[PDB]
Copies of this chain bind each other. A is one copy, B any other.
Amino acid sequence: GSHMYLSKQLCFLFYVSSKEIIKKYTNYLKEYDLTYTGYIVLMAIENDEKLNIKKLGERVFLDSGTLTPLLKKLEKKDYVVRTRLQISLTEQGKAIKSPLAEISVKVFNEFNISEREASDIINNLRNFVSKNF
């Protein structure tokens, strides 16, 4: 019944779409030596902001096991600093977010997807998370 046929379609279609969207980011991100998840973390920390790792994890839907070695790497890259712990952006981190911001726009402009189609996806995923997170 519908729980089976709809979930199968949901599963496959999220698998293909996610796979392929991440591929396009990763392409742009190589030039910066950043992974996709690393990019997400940087983009999520605001410039005036100091965060603890738990709250940061809540915001980007990552576990501590994932976020912890990732922050160390970003620290090594001099993009974030940890101050006893709080996380924030370095001047280099704040600066690198200028070009990084262009990447989402670039990816979107590269896909065949209209402004109206994007709007619908936004609305529906809001809810898909909304009544869910």
Contact = CB atoms under 8 A, between A and B. Distances in A.
A83 interface: no
Interface string A89-133: 000000000000110110111011101011111101111110111
Nearest to A108: B7
B7 A104 contact: yes
Interface residues of A, number: 53
B17 A14 contact: yes
B131 A112 contact: yes
A115 B56 CA distance: 33
Interface of A: 2-4, 6-21, 23, 36-37, 40, 43, 60-62, 101-102, 104-105, 107-109, 111-113, 115, 117-122, 124-129, 131-133
